[PDB]
Write an enzyme that holds these catalytic residues in place. Structure first.
Site, PDB file in Angstrom:
ATOM      1  N   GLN A   1       0.830  -1.193   0.000  1.00 29.19           N
ATOM      2  CA  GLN A   1       0.000   0.000   0.000  1.00 29.19           C
ATOM      3  C   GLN A   1       0.869   1.251   0.000  1.00 29.19           C
ATOM      4  OE1 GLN A   1      -2.828   0.062   3.195  1.00 29.19           O
ATOM      5  NE2 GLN A   1      -4.026   1.741   2.295  1.00 29.19           N
TER       6      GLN A   1
ATOM      7  N   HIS B   1       1.199   3.832  -3.649  1.00 30.58           N
ATOM      8  CA  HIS B   1       0.565   5.135  -3.565  1.00 30.58           C
ATOM      9  C   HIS B   1       1.520   6.278  -3.877  1.00 30.58           C
ATOM     10  CE1 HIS B   1      -2.675   2.801  -1.691  1.00 30.58           C
ATOM     11  NE2 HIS B   1      -3.451   3.850  -1.893  1.00 30.58           N
TER      12      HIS B   1
ATOM     13  N   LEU C   1      -5.983  -2.852 -11.058  1.00 30.91           N
ATOM     14  CA  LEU C   1      -5.415  -4.160 -10.786  1.00 30.91           C
ATOM     15  C   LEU C   1      -4.687  -4.231  -9.448  1.00 30.91           C
ATOM     16  CD1 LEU C   1      -3.554  -6.261 -13.414  1.00 30.91           C
ATOM     17  CD2 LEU C   1      -2.358  -5.491 -11.400  1.00 30.91           C
ATOM     18  N   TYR C   2      -4.202  -3.105  -8.915  1.00 28.27           N
ATOM     19  CA  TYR C   2      -3.554  -3.117  -7.602  1.00 28.27           C
ATOM     20  C   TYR C   2      -4.508  -2.904  -6.429  1.00 28.27           C
ATOM     21  CZ  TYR C   2       1.579  -3.558  -7.862  1.00 28.27           C
ATOM     22  OH  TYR C   2       2.874  -4.002  -7.977  1.00 28.27           O
TER      23      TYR C   2
ATOM     24  N   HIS D   1      -7.080  -5.208  -1.543  1.00 30.19           N
ATOM     25  CA  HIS D   1      -7.777  -5.165  -0.263  1.00 30.19           C
ATOM     26  C   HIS D   1      -8.067  -6.529   0.364  1.00 30.19           C
ATOM     27  CE1 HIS D   1      -8.428  -1.342  -2.355  1.00 30.19           C
ATOM     28  NE2 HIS D   1      -8.344  -0.826  -1.141  1.00 30.19           N
TER      29      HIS D   1
ATOM     30  N   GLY E   1      -0.444  -8.177 -14.455  1.00 30.71           N
ATOM     31  CA  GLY E   1       0.261  -7.424 -13.436  1.00 30.71           C
ATOM     32  C   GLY E   1       1.764  -7.392 -13.602  1.00 30.71           C
TER      33      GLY E   1
ATOM     34  N   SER F   1       4.234  -3.999 -13.877  1.00 34.02           N
ATOM     35  CA  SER F   1       5.035  -3.818 -12.679  1.00 34.02           C
ATOM     36  C   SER F   1       6.520  -3.816 -13.016  1.00 34.02           C
ATOM     37  CB  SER F   1       4.686  -4.910 -11.661  1.00 34.02           C
ATOM     38  OG  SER F   1       5.364  -4.720 -10.438  1.00 34.02           O
TER      39      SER F   1
HETATM   40  C1  HEM Z   1      -6.822  -0.845   6.125  1.00 40.08           C
HETATM   41  C2  HEM Z   1      -6.399  -0.951   4.862  1.00 40.08           C
HETATM   42  C3  HEM Z   1      -6.982  -0.158   3.668  1.00 40.08           C
HETATM   43  C4  HEM Z   1      -7.908   0.807   3.644  1.00 40.08           C
HETATM   44  C5  HEM Z   1      -8.675   1.437   4.820  1.00 40.08           C
HETATM   45  C6  HEM Z   1      -8.098   1.213   2.266  1.00 40.08           C
HETATM   46  C7  HEM Z   1      -8.969   2.190   1.823  1.00 40.08           C
HETATM   47  C8  HEM Z   1      -8.985   2.720   0.551  1.00 40.08           C
HETATM   48  C9  HEM Z   1      -9.859   3.775   0.088  1.00 40.08           C
HETATM   49  C10 HEM Z   1     -10.925   4.485   0.937  1.00 40.08           C
HETATM   50  C11 HEM Z   1      -9.582   4.020  -1.188  1.00 40.08           C
HETATM   51  C12 HEM Z   1     -10.280   5.070  -2.072  1.00 40.08           C
HETATM   52  C13 HEM Z   1     -11.308   4.395  -2.971  1.00 40.08           C
HETATM   53  C14 HEM Z   1     -12.217   5.433  -3.582  1.00 40.08           C
HETATM   54  O1  HEM Z   1     -12.058   6.644  -3.274  1.00 40.08           O
HETATM   55  O2  HEM Z   1     -13.108   5.048  -4.382  1.00 40.08           O
HETATM   56  C15 HEM Z   1      -8.516   3.124  -1.593  1.00 40.08           C
HETATM   57  C16 HEM Z   1      -7.940   3.060  -2.845  1.00 40.08           C
HETATM   58  C17 HEM Z   1      -6.886   2.243  -3.192  1.00 40.08           C
HETATM   59  N1  HEM Z   1      -6.418   1.177  -2.439  1.00 40.08           N
HETATM   60 FE1  HEM Z   1      -6.663   0.970  -0.412  1.00 40.08          FE
HETATM   61  N2  HEM Z   1      -7.258   0.463   1.467  1.00 40.08           N
HETATM   62  C18 HEM Z   1      -6.565  -0.389   2.301  1.00 40.08           C
HETATM   63  C19 HEM Z   1      -5.629  -1.313   1.902  1.00 40.08           C
HETATM   64  C20 HEM Z   1      -5.021  -1.341   0.668  1.00 40.08           C
HETATM   65  C21 HEM Z   1      -3.848  -2.119   0.336  1.00 40.08           C
HETATM   66  C22 HEM Z   1      -3.081  -3.044   1.298  1.00 40.08           C
HETATM   67  C23 HEM Z   1      -3.546  -1.898  -0.940  1.00 40.08           C
HETATM   68  C24 HEM Z   1      -2.345  -2.560  -1.656  1.00 40.08           C
HETATM   69  C25 HEM Z   1      -2.016  -2.313  -2.926  1.00 40.08           C
HETATM   70  C26 HEM Z   1      -4.530  -0.964  -1.470  1.00 40.08           C
HETATM   71  C27 HEM Z   1      -4.599  -0.462  -2.753  1.00 40.08           C
HETATM   72  C28 HEM Z   1      -5.356   0.625  -3.139  1.00 40.08           C
HETATM   73  C29 HEM Z   1      -5.170   1.381  -4.359  1.00 40.08           C
HETATM   74  C30 HEM Z   1      -4.093   1.094  -5.420  1.00 40.08           C
HETATM   75  C31 HEM Z   1      -6.081   2.354  -4.397  1.00 40.08           C
HETATM   76  C32 HEM Z   1      -6.249   3.406  -5.520  1.00 40.08           C
HETATM   77  C33 HEM Z   1      -5.615   4.725  -5.074  1.00 40.08           C
HETATM   78  C34 HEM Z   1      -5.964   5.862  -6.008  1.00 40.08           C
HETATM   79  O3  HEM Z   1      -6.691   5.631  -7.013  1.00 40.08           O
HETATM   80  O4  HEM Z   1      -5.507   7.007  -5.737  1.00 40.08           O
HETATM   81  N3  HEM Z   1      -5.419  -0.643  -0.457  1.00 40.08           N
HETATM   82  N4  HEM Z   1      -8.169   2.342  -0.503  1.00 40.08           N
HETATM   83  C1  LIG Z   2      -0.327  -7.734  -9.831  1.00 37.07           C
HETATM   84  O1  LIG Z   2       0.853  -7.170  -9.339  1.00 37.07           O
HETATM   85  C2  LIG Z   2       1.982  -7.871  -9.769  1.00 37.07           C
HETATM   86  C3  LIG Z   2       3.240  -7.491  -9.338  1.00 37.07           C
HETATM   87  C4  LIG Z   2       4.351  -8.194  -9.777  1.00 37.07           C
HETATM   88  C5  LIG Z   2       4.193  -9.282 -10.621  1.00 37.07           C
HETATM   89  C6  LIG Z   2       5.403 -10.035 -11.138  1.00 37.07           C
HETATM   90  N1  LIG Z   2       6.432  -9.442 -11.728  1.00 37.07           N
HETATM   91  O2  LIG Z   2       7.323 -10.322 -12.102  1.00 37.07           O
HETATM   92  C7  LIG Z   2       6.941 -11.522 -11.787  1.00 37.07           C
HETATM   93  C8  LIG Z   2       7.757 -12.768 -12.119  1.00 37.07           C
HETATM   94  C9  LIG Z   2       7.272 -13.245 -13.498  1.00 37.07           C
HETATM   95  O3  LIG Z   2       7.308 -12.452 -14.477  1.00 37.07           O
HETATM   96  O4  LIG Z   2       6.812 -14.408 -13.672  1.00 37.07           O
HETATM   97  C10 LIG Z   2       5.667 -11.448 -11.169  1.00 37.07           C
HETATM   98  C11 LIG Z   2       4.826 -12.608 -10.612  1.00 37.07           C
HETATM   99  C12 LIG Z   2       4.762 -13.811 -11.297  1.00 37.07           C
HETATM  100  C13 LIG Z   2       4.035 -14.876 -10.800  1.00 37.07           C
HETATM  101  C14 LIG Z   2       3.360 -14.758  -9.602  1.00 37.07           C
HETATM  102  O5  LIG Z   2       2.633 -15.859  -9.141  1.00 37.07           O
HETATM  103  C15 LIG Z   2       1.844 -15.636  -8.013  1.00 37.07           C
HETATM  104  C16 LIG Z   2       3.410 -13.562  -8.901  1.00 37.07           C
HETATM  105  C17 LIG Z   2       4.151 -12.495  -9.400  1.00 37.07           C
HETATM  106  C18 LIG Z   2       2.935  -9.649 -11.066  1.00 37.07           C
HETATM  107  C19 LIG Z   2       1.829  -8.949 -10.630  1.00 37.07           C
END
Ligand code: HEM
Ligand SMILES: COc1ccc(-c2noc(CC(=O)O)c2-c2ccc(OC)cc2)cc1
Ligand SMILES: *[C@@H]1O[C@H](CO)[C@@H](O[C@@H]2O[C@H](CO)[C@@H](O[C@H]3O[C@H](CO[C@H]4O[C@H](CO[C@H]5O[C@H](CO)[C@@H](O)[C@H](O)[C@@H]5O)[C@@H](O)[C@H](O)[C@@H]4O)[C@@H](O)[C@H](O)[C@@H]3O)[C@H](O)[C@H]2NC(C)=O)[C@H](O)[C@H]1NC(C)=O
Ligand SMILES: *[C@@H]1O[C@H](CO)[C@@H](O[C@@H]2O[C@H](CO)[C@@H](O[C@H]3O[C@H](CO[C@H]4O[C@H](CO[C@H]5O[C@H](CO)[C@@H](O)[C@H](O)[C@@H]5O)[C@@H](O)[C@H](O)[C@@H]4O)[C@@H](O)[C@H](O)[C@@H]3O)[C@H](O)[C@H]2NC(C)=O)[C@H](O)[C@H]1NC(C)=O
Ligand code: HEM
Ligand SMILES: *[C@@H]1O[C@H](CO)[C@@H](O[C@@H]2O[C@H](CO)[C@@H](O)[C@H](O)[C@H]2NC(C)=O)[C@H](O)[C@H]1NC(C)=O
Ligand SMILES: *[C@@H]1O[C@H](CO)[C@@H](O[C@@H]2O[C@H](CO)[C@@H](O)[C@H](O)[C@H]2NC(C)=O)[C@H](O)[C@H]1NC(C)=O
Ligand SMILES: *[C@@H]1O[C@H](CO)[C@@H](O[C@@H]2O[C@H](CO)[C@@H](O)[C@H](O)[C@H]2NC(C)=O)[C@H](O)[C@H]1NC(C)=O
Ligand SMILES: *[C@@H]1O[C@H](CO)[C@@H](O[C@@H]2O[C@H](CO)[C@@H](O)[C@H](O)[C@H]2NC(C)=O)[C@H](O)[C@H]1NC(C)=O
Ligand SMILES: COc1ccc(-c2noc(CC(=O)O)c2-c2ccc(OC)cc2)cc1
Ligand SMILES: CCCCCCCCO[C@@H]1O[C@H](CO)[C@@H](O)[C@H](O)[C@H]1O
Ligand SMILES: CCCCCCCCO[C@@H]1O[C@H](CO)[C@@H](O)[C@H](O)[C@H]1O
Ligand SMILES: CCCCCCCCO[C@@H]1O[C@H](CO)[C@@H](O)[C@H](O)[C@H]1O
Lengths: 553, 553
Positions: B172, B176, B353-354, B357, B495, B499
């Site tokens: 996270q 961000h 894709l990221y 949650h 992904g 990435s």
């Molecule tokens: C307690 C943990 C978490 C909370 C409370 C939370 C909450 C939120 C909220 C409220 C949003 C905004 C969504 C919207 O406005 O429609 C968001 C977006 C997002 N969340 Fe989290 N989330 C959590 C964990 C995570 C984790 C671990 C990831 C790991 C990648 C993640 C990835 C994202 C991403 C990539 C976005 C989009 C950000 C953007 O568009 O600016 N979240 N999350």
């Molecule tokens: C969705 O966010 C991501 C972030 C990173 C990767 C990623 N980048 O390189 C490799 C290695 C590769 O290319 O195979 C991987 C990967 C491959 C297999 C795998 O199985 C669970 C998990 C990750 C993929 C998705």
């Protein structure tokens, strides 16, 4: 203690890094050399150094031997040598860019902040004895005295290579889309954030000005009709910031992408030509795409004008500037095998280097009339009075001035050459020999080796005191020319890498963009592949005048 | 008439271009195929298609055969396959970027305006019968009902691969810096203009915030001392915009580069760790460079933290995420032979894709204590109370949730998954099968081939009506997982290209930057080449806790 980086110890693109209080280390990584100064050559670099012919000899082969080049141009050797020119010259420019006026080192701020110009060599450090490093006098010559004594035109020296004022106004129009130095932010900062051939001198350097210039119908630009001819619109119709004489009659101002194009009739000539071309391309795209909205008809026509701009500047502009019997070619596919970064960042040295004010004549001959600078500068009715056909015809017949050799700048615009010397001291550019070593040339040992001349060289030895203290811009302009050519060795070996890296680093040259769907089908893609400046003029006019980058015989 | 591009006729990265009123043409340029639909394969493409093993089989070879990979990791084959991983996957991402929310075609505005996100496939056209093209129902399922019925966690499904919450808060925190969607400008627009690993979540996404966070002494960041431990400074000391509960006690707010890192204790945990690392690197650089000012000590330490961020995310983050016996390697020199554009532009599909949650647990176990979401979200004293040693130790022991398989999102944050489905409809993303075809996979023929499952697949067949109408994010999360893995096939093949292109498209990986002088000598350059997350934690703490991306045995 003395800063050791003031001595410029690191050779062949080595990186001087200060350690401790008084010592330094050179970073010889991928320089091709090793050692403390980066002077111990590797095996392949030694072989390619001893087998390397001089740039003057290459200029001799490319400008002579017409029977040989008639065979080369008819075969694949043309494509092989073109690929060689592109890869070898653009390899010499750092991509991603390295430094700027703020940072004499690699930084994330220098990478991401495109408001800066970049620079090839670092600045002269602030703790150097001499303003140019260590060699020279404690203060530098007067810029007004150097300009008056060495750069001021006495008698008009025409370009022996045949160059037009059509060329020269094309060079002023073309280069002011990536040379927009910010008066607010200062030297080393630019308003042209495209850093290349984005045609921001036609469509504006920001989006709000772009929407002020667009008709929003059929993807066209706004325009006005005078005497049955298409001209850029009035500022009353296109309300955006245009520099003009305080107290002009607007409703006679013209609105274009570059803020200063009202100040010269040839610049507004080219802006008229490209605007007519934009709307012609919009008509051609709408014939083939009835379904497209205003945005797609606009943006694809912009990409068509970008592509045919690069086509014209490689195959005619640089062709006329080179004098080569080798016919140059714009084909992006030539770089699809190499590692080539499709990016450009304008350097401050490259800004210094395009001050081609020697191209401007003593007067501006238009047919039977002969207009002075006071009659030509700032003039607002000459374009609509004569018409684009007549001003293209007159500019394609009047000779332009030789750039190199020194002593060829008119006194009306000599002040520009003064400020660019003073700006060169503000930006702390390194000596001219250090830029010769950076661009693959041996430094000069004397001023008379520089000029090939007795009088000016000795007076320069009195002014500077050492050849290793000569400044960048005076060194480019006072250099001896190659025989019967527009300028000299250092303008070749410094200007070509920036210019070609700027032409094919455009993303339309990338494999991802260089295809027919980007240009709306085969029609616009053949508009890019077939563009001449004769087609740029005579397809947008009623009559076809003499249009060329060279005078007629 | 019906828009033919709604049928998605162009196969294998072909470009659908409307001609006339009702017809179309595909642009098969450099797709490897020819024909009207771009389906007639070339000779080399046919050979490489028949000799291409399936992604599940490759996952089988990379996750089994430990005796073989112990030999591969000890030889040059490790370097060979890594180059193969880098070149093959990043080739699948367009560089320069192609489209955005505004333009479903290539344009100069899509290239230059970094305020947009980009996108790999065009939008679904506005004149399509179905909201997903031509196949499906006239309206799409309720996002709240899809989230409640298919994405809502009932029982906690832990990751069988062993993933920490140290991993999940790292994911996270890490993501961000390039996922900052603009609430003012709307969906499809970003505030993170670096579009990659610039550490703008540490140093700010603009320069004014950056100067608000800098100490301007020894290149350090501002900081405050609590209980003898180094923490980010108060907003009273570093006055910049930080989102916090309306009515907190500032003088207990903390100021960091990302505006929302105050809202979670693990995000402020990582911001504390990286701030301590920044000032440690500043101490190491100042020991070796007594002459450097504040800027060079700052910017080179930023480049060191950028480099060691990419080192840690390739060799530990993606290593833990892959489960490979092949030990991954961060070496930019692997790409110095290929044509590889050192640029990145964040795609909207990669933002979709990221949304990981499912990684978040039911509760947050810290030692003997067990905190709920209401006790953990928005909590301001837990970081200073336990300390970074104790929260790293506790987060490296609690399991995280499995991403794929569906039905694993806690109800506290399920609303996020709702909005991202609704946002997917605002952005007009193409169906899930079209992204499978774009990323080199065969589309699913049924919902039960998607899930490997009987109940959910049949209820989805009632909701969507056709497999070719399945949306992007639900398709990624409801897909069957590879056996004993964190997620499934489409999250792999979609992904990994974004990435890895985002990791080595950073300009520090270019030949121009990847040298020791960029990092202030061999000290910082070995700080990049030797970085683990154990060194990221335990060199900035008093005690060394258990720090890992996986739970202990
Ligand atoms: C307690 C943990 C978490 C909370 C409370 C939370 C909450 C939120 C909220 C409220 C949003 C905004 C969504 C919207 O406005 O429609 C968001 C977006 C997002 N969340 Fe989290 N989330 C959590 C964990 C995570 C984790 C671990 C990831 C790991 C990648 C993640 C990835 C994202 C991403 C990539 C976005 C989009 C950000 C953007 O568009 O600016 N979240 N999350
Ligand atoms: C969705 O966010 C991501 C972030 C990173 C990767 C990623 N980048 O390189 C490799 C290695 C590769 O290319 O195979 C991987 C990967 C491959 C297999 C795998 O199985 C669970 C998990 C990750 C993929 C998705
Ligand atoms: C590309 O780079 C250029 C050049 O770096 C950028 O343009 C410059 O941006 C600079 C910063 O935006 C600007 O410099 C500033 O310098 C003085 C002094 O700076 C002070 O900094 C802190 C601030 O302390 C302040 O704290 C409170 C908090 O709310 C303020 O209200 C209060 O006013 C107080 O000063 C002090 O600790 C320090 O002692 C200084 O006082 C500022 O006062 C200036 O107004 C200016 O903001 C510089 O002028 C810009 N221009 C140039 C030509 O350098 C450009 O932004 C960048 N482009 C991109 C896209 O990033
Ligand atoms: C990256 O791209 C984004 C998205 O394109 C950019 O952000 C947007 O920028 C838009 C323009 O800056 C902005 O849209 C505008 O939409 C209308 C525009 O209508 C204008 O023109 C008509 C008619 O012409 C008028 O012009 C004169 C000028 O002086 C007026 O006085 C007179 O009234 C005359 O009618 C009018 O209807 C209207 O009044 C406007 O002048 C405006 O109404 C909007 O307020 C806005 O300006 C859009 O909001 C921006 N944001 C988004 C999310 O789209 C972004 O700038 C770009 N980034 C970079 C770096 O280029
Ligand atoms: C009548 C003809 C010309 C006039 C009146 C003129 C005038 C000027 C002036 C006043 C400046 C500003 C200098 C300063 O502010 O210190 C300038 C800069 C410049 N001139 Fe010209 N010039 C002419 C011809 C040309 C031509 C033919 C070229 C061809 C390349 C050229 C290239 C440049 C460049 C590149 C700059 C720098 C622009 C920038 O930094 O934004 N000039 N000129
Ligand atoms: C690398 O370059 C530096 C500077 O050009 C050389 O240092 C000079 O060496 C001579 C001979 O030993 C001394 O008389 C000077 O005082 C030195 N100047 C400085 C500034 O150190 C250095 O010798 C070069 N490296 C090698 C291996 O020759
Ligand atoms: C701007 O150019 C116009 C050319 O149309 C100049 O007007 C002409 O001047 C010449 C001699 O000065 C006359 O022979 C023409 O008959 C004039 N034509 C017109 C239509 O006026 C004008 O003088 C120039 N501006 C300045 C300030 O000299
Ligand atoms: C390229 O793809 C299009 C769309 O999938 C194909 O066009 C369809 O062909 C079937 C078979 O005759 C018709 O029933 C449909 O009405 C067509 N749809 C459209 C939108 O034209 C097309 O046949 C494909 N090209 C080739 C050579 O098979
Ligand atoms: C934020 O976290 C702190 C822990 O640092 C919470 O305070 C603790 O609460 C537990 C029970 O919930 C007690 O057993 C601890 O003794 C408390 N410690 C301290 C230092 O107060 C705090 O309750 C959390 N915030 C919220 C809103 O729940
Ligand atoms: C200073 O502004 C420029 C603009 C363009 C070029 C340039 N680009 O490619 C070539 C061909 C080549 O690389 O040799 C040349 C060139 C070479 C020789 C030449 O003799 C007078 C004139 C121009 C050089 C400088
Ligand atoms: C025989 C014809 C050869 C044409 C190829 C010429 C292109 C190579 O150009 C070379 O570029 C180098 C770096 O900028 C310079 O140092 C050399 O002097 C120059 O000749
Ligand atoms: C393989 C054919 C070689 C023919 C020899 C060509 C001779 C070109 O000779 C060149 O003349 C120039 C002055 O005119 C000098 O400045 C160059 O240094 C010199 O190499
Ligand atoms: C759409 C054009 C597809 C051409 C390339 C196939 C896309 C997927 O290429 C991927 O390469 C990876 C590298 O190790 C492999 O692990 C995956 O199995 C493979 O799917």
């Amino acid at each position: 203690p003395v800063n050791p980086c003031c001595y410029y110890p690191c050779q062949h693109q080595g990186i001087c890094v200060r350690f401790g209080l008084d010592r330094y280390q050179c970073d010889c990584t991928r320089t091709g050399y090793s050692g403390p100064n980066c002077t111990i050559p590797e095996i392949w670099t030694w072989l390619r150094t001893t087998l390397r012919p001089s740039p003057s000899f290459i200029h001799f082969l490319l400008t002579h031997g017409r029977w040989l080049w008639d065979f080369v141009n008819a075969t694949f050797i043309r494509d092989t040598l073109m690929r060689l020119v592109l890869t070898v010259r653009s390899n010499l420019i750092p991509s991603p860019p390295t430094y700027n006026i703020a940072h004499d080192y690699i930084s994330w701020e220098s990478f991401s902040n495109v408001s800066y110009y970049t620079r090839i060599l670092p600045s002269v450090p602030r703790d150097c004895p001499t303003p140019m490093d260590t060699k020279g006098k404690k203060q530098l010559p007067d810029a007004e005295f150097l300009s008056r004594r060495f750069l001021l035109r006495r008698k008009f020296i025409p370009d022996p290579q045949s160059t037009n004022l059509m060329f020269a106004f094309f060079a002023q129009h073309f280069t002011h889309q990536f040379f927009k130095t910010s008066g607010k932010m200062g030297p080393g900062f630019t308003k042209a954030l495209g850093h290349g051939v984005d045609l921001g001198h036609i469509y504006g350097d920001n989006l709000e000005r772009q929407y002020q210039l667009r008709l929003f119908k059929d993807g066209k630009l706004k325009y006005q009709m005078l005497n049955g001819e298409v001209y850029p619109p009035s500022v009353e119709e296109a309300p955006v910031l245009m520099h003009y004489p305080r107290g002009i009659p607007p409703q006679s101002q013209m609105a274009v992408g570059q803020e200063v194009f009202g100040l010269l009739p040839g610049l507004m000539l080219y802006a008229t030509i490209w605007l007519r071309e934009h709307n012609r391309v919009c008509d051609l795209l709408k014939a083939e795409h009835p379904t497209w909205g205003d945005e797609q008809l606009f943006q694809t026509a912009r990409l068509i004008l970008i592509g045919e701009t690069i086509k014209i500047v490689i195959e005619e502009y640089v062709q006329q500037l080179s004098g080569y019997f080798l016919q140059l070619k714009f084909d992006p596919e030539l770089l699809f095998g190499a590692q080539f970064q499709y990016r450009n960042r304008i350097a401050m040295e490259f800004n210094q280097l395009y001050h081609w004010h020697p191209l401007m004549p003593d007067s501006f001959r238009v047919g039977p009339q002969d207009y002075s600078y006071e009659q030509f500068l700032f003039n607002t009715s000459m374009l609509v009075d004569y018409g684009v056909e007549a001003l293209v015809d007159a500019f394609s017949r009047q000779p332009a001035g030789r750039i190199g050799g020194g002593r060829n700048i008119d006194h009306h615009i000599l002040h520009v050459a003064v400020d660019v010397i003073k700006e060169s001291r503000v930006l702390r550019l390194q000596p001219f020999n250090e830029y010769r070593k950076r661009f693959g040339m041996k430094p000069y040992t004397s001023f008379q080796e520089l000029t090939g001349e007795k009088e000016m060289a000795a007076e320069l030895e009195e002014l500077y005191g050492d050849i290793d203290a000569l400044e960048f811009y005076p060194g480019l302009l006072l250099e001896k020319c190659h025989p019967n050519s527009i300028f000299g060795e250092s303008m070749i070996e410094m200007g070509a890498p920036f210019s070609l890296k700027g032409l094919l680093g455009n993303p339309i040259c990338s494999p991802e963009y260089w295809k027919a769907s980007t240009f709306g089908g085969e029609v616009g893609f053949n508009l890019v592949k077939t563009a001449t400046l004769k087609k740029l003029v005579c397809l947008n006019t009623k009559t076809c005048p003499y249009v060329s980058f060279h005078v007629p015989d």
